[PDB]
Amino acid sequence: LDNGLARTPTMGWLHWERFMCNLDCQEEPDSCISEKLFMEMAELMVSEGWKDAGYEYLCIDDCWMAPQRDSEGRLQADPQRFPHGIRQLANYVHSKGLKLGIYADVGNKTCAGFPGSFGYYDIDAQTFADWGVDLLKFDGCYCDSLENLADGYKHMSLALNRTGRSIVYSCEWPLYMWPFQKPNYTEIRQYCNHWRNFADIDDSWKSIKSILDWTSFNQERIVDVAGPGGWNDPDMLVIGNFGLSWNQQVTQMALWAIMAAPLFMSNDLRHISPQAKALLQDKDVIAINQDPLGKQGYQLRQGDNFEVWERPLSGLAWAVAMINRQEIGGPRSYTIAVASLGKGVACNPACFITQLLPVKRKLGFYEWTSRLRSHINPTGTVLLQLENTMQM
Amino acid sequence: LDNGLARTPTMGWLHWERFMCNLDCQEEPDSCISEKLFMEMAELMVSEGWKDAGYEYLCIDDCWMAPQRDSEGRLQADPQRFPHGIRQLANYVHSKGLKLGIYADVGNKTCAGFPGSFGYYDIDAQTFADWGVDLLKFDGCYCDSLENLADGYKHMSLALNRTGRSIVYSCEWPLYMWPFQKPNYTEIRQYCNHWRNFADIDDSWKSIKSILDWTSFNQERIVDVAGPGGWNDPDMLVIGNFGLSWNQQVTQMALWAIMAAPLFMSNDLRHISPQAKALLQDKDVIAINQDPLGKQGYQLRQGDNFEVWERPLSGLAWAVAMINRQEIGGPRSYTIAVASLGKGVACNPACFITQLLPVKRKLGFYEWTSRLRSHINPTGTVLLQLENTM
């Protein structure tokens, strides 16, 4: 989408994986979808260094809506859980230096059963723009036909455009097409700043493995489509929650940087370990995700429960991720000719190699003819940055 | 098995899950199956508080053997990896106040293809006894019949008894039988101090869940046979490795206590986080696992992706574990009538409840009319101890 937005992958926070559709503010007030939850996340995004690390967008997912449109046929915030309305939340969010995202559905109902946008694309689009919305996530539930799906996504895109407000446009179009026909990614790209390809993440190693395996299986279809203004969305970061070991958290953060993924944390910023915080705020790994070249990485090799992924970066640098998929035993040795990395460009005639994950270690100069030797933890990843150099 | 051992579930360290069959001492001397590995672990079990918490058996799994028996038809330790031999390793482990476990196979080869004990049961028993072995893990690979399986486990049991040495006998008899015919646990217990029921654990949450689901499915058949001298073995603790979140580690420690499981760590005692070490050395939770009554706990209920498990303890106490199997979202609220717990006696007329996991805190006095409300982390467990006021 040539709206001049999302020139790097969008970064921020989205409630869905951690808070889902909790409407019980009486018995579960700390986890219920309310203006107070968003306001509290906003303060913490500022005070706990998230904004400074680049997490800019505070996003509302499903279950923000009143059950019905007003007398004027516009969407309304739930009166009990959002008594001060979207506009005042927007002012609060903007006052802290952040941008607000919100959710809607191309079809007749949101996936949770709240009012769909079909019949109202232009008024809804104008509603968000009046409210001061800076991002829309646009879901595909309750859509009759491929034709409606496509028409709706295309329509809402132009509708948002017509408003003349800068609004990142995040689409689930490809994901709702797979049951019927292969998506056309050149079409999707024209209309959307990023697009969900695969099933919702959850707080599990199984869910990470399943997203990586679908991505590497489908990479010829989707990798070359991605670039400034248009990204593949493999769903939220779940680092800081309950289901992933340290090694599995390092693997998500490493591979979301490789894949030029939007980085939407879905966690509780009020209750997050220092270790999870340091990984999500890791300046050098964010710098790989946010690399201005904006070319998505890929799986170079697979076999013997090892994977090697790489991503080309600005300035003849490469990011390299080595994953140990063996879920038994101890750290496994992997050796590779540095000549096989970065299409033989990265270390010609030499590279300087820095390990970034699991820990930051300068490894030194590797001649084009050198071998790189690593030890990789079970379900973990070693992330390396290869800098092309003349020295040595 | 009435040999006077395993009066509480056996606690120790076993190499298999973390170190496996690493024979490469040239490129990986730190992590290969060698006497240096066992001596490092023995030293740390003393120095790092493991023996004090009750971890007592330092156990060798498969891949310790020379490829062939000796001239005199005996099992030998690989001459390069175990140069001082097992008897001398046993002497060293004994000098630290610990006990030594070793591994053999009832069939023709071990699972990793080293010498089997079929045909050599009496000699193998006497060799282990002579070496000063305090525990045998006896695997079931390369065994052509159920008749040979049964006769081998029974035969090695009697042959160990005949040596005169107190040796804990850990069997894999049920595991190898179950594909073909339902084991008779009353009989297995007559021959075995503990018995593997199910597929090898690995360093994953999928593994843990599969072991718990198998145990709750089979509980009618296995829970009542367990008791002082004879335990269900759901396989090694993998806390301190790579695959489990903090909440999944808590679930393993909590449910291995509820299940009166043997507690065999398979980790690297040289490289273990302080949080993993405090969970494994948790005095209150080990005291549940090690309860002298020795009555295995059981699943009380399942539904809404929650499990409630409970275990009867000495002196009118109960342990209760609440598992959140929902792998999405946040801490989920669960409430149960305290009258539904411990067969209606735990909190009649009242009980004092202490949370032990994931953190210790006194919750206070609950009356027989009360409901216990808890928030449980996804893939986590809340472990409670209930003390009756009488």
Ligand SMILES: *[C@@H]1O[C@H](CO)[C@@H](O[C@@H]2O[C@H](CO)[C@@H](O[C@@H]3O[C@H](CO[C@H]4O[C@H](CO)[C@@H](O)[C@H](O)[C@@H]4O)[C@@H](O)[C@H](O[C@H]4O[C@H](CO)[C@@H](O)[C@H](O)[C@@H]4O)[C@@H]3O)[C@H](O)[C@H]2NC(C)=O)[C@H](O)[C@H]1NC(C)=O
């Ligand atoms: C509604 O939809 C329309 C349809 O596309 C959008 O219009 C486009 O807006 C984008 C983003 O601003 C425009 O892209 C920008 O074009 C600017 C001008 O480019 C022309 O003129 C220069 C002279 O300086 C020529 O050299 C050049 O070849 C072009 O012909 C550039 O200044 C912009 O570049 C800056 O940012 C980009 C990243 O976006 C960087 O690559 C650059 O380094 C630089 O910093 C940019 O290229 C595009 O021209 C518009 N297209 C059309 C058809 O008009 C609306 O923005 C959209 N509105 C909303 C609110 O959604």
Ligand SMILES: *[C@@H]1O[C@H](CO)[C@@H](O[C@@H]2O[C@H](CO)[C@@H](O[C@@H]3O[C@H](CO)[C@@H](O)[C@H](O[C@H]4O[C@H](CO)[C@@H](O)[C@H](O)[C@@H]4O)[C@@H]3O)[C@H](O)[C@H]2NC(C)=O)[C@H](O)[C@H]1NC(C)=O
């Ligand atoms: C070989 O097999 C035989 C037959 O099973 C086996 O004999 C059994 O040994 C046990 C334990 O040694 C015997 O039960 C004991 O009886 C004695 C004295 O009469 C008691 O002292 C023992 O327990 C007491 O002490 C414990 C430790 O302090 C206390 O905790 C406990 O409560 C008791 O106070 C125990 O009751 C059992 O009777 C015999 N069985 C027969 C048929 O003789 C022998 O151990 C096996 N040998 C080897 C080497 O495995």
Ligand SMILES: *[C@@H]1O[C@H](CO)[C@@H](O[C@@H]2O[C@H](CO)[C@@H](O[C@@H]3O[C@H](CO)[C@@H](O)[C@H](O)[C@@H]3O)[C@H](O)[C@H]2NC(C)=O)[C@H](O)[C@H]1NC(C)=O
């Ligand atoms: C360990 O290996 C040996 C040798 O391969 C096994 O002994 C062999 O077992 C087979 C299968 O039971 C025996 O075959 C049987 O032979 C009789 C004839 O005597 C025949 O009537 C049966 O129908 C059957 O074919 C074989 O005789 C026997 N070989 C020897 C050398 O005794 C042994 O059982 C293996 N142990 C285990 C526990 O698997």
Ligand SMILES: *[C@@H]1O[C@H](CO)[C@@H](O[C@@H]2O[C@H](CO)[C@@H](O)[C@H](O)[C@H]2NC(C)=O)[C@H](O)[C@H]1NC(C)=O
């Ligand atoms: C996928 O959709 C895109 C964009 O709608 C198609 O590209 C254009 O299609 C229009 C209408 O047929 C043509 O006028 C253009 O010449 C096409 N190319 C470009 C770059 O705009 C694309 O052809 C579609 N089908 C595919 C890829 O098979």
Ligand SMILES: *[C@@H]1O[C@H](CO)[C@@H](O[C@@H]2O[C@H](CO)[C@@H](O)[C@H](O)[C@H]2NC(C)=O)[C@H](O)[C@H]1NC(C)=O
């Ligand atoms: C399971 O095995 C046990 C022990 O081998 C069997 O119980 C024995 O049965 C014999 C014959 O009735 C009696 O002499 C013993 O008194 C029993 N021992 C014990 C400790 O109970 C039992 O019969 C077997 N059950 C089945 C279904 O095979």
Ligand SMILES: O=S1(=O)N[C@@H]2[C@H](O)[C@@H](O)[C@@H](O)[C@@H](CO)[C@@H]2O1
């Ligand atoms: O759970 S869903 O079927 N998946 C959809 C989306 O894919 C999710 O990301 C989230 O936005 C949900 C909101 O209800 C949507 O419903």
Ligand SMILES: O=S1(=O)N[C@@H]2[C@H](O)[C@@H](O)[C@@H](O)[C@@H](CO)[C@@H]2O1
């Ligand atoms: O991996 S195995 O098939 N499982 C068996 C056992 O069940 C394991 O615990 C371990 O002792 C192994 C040693 O070779 C055995 O081989």
Ligand SMILES: *[C@@H]1O[C@H](CO)[C@@H](O)[C@H](O)[C@H]1NC(C)=O
């Ligand atoms: C919404 O419902 C109407 C009324 O049944 C139907 O005609 C229309 O096709 C639906 N829209 C979508 C996008 O599925």
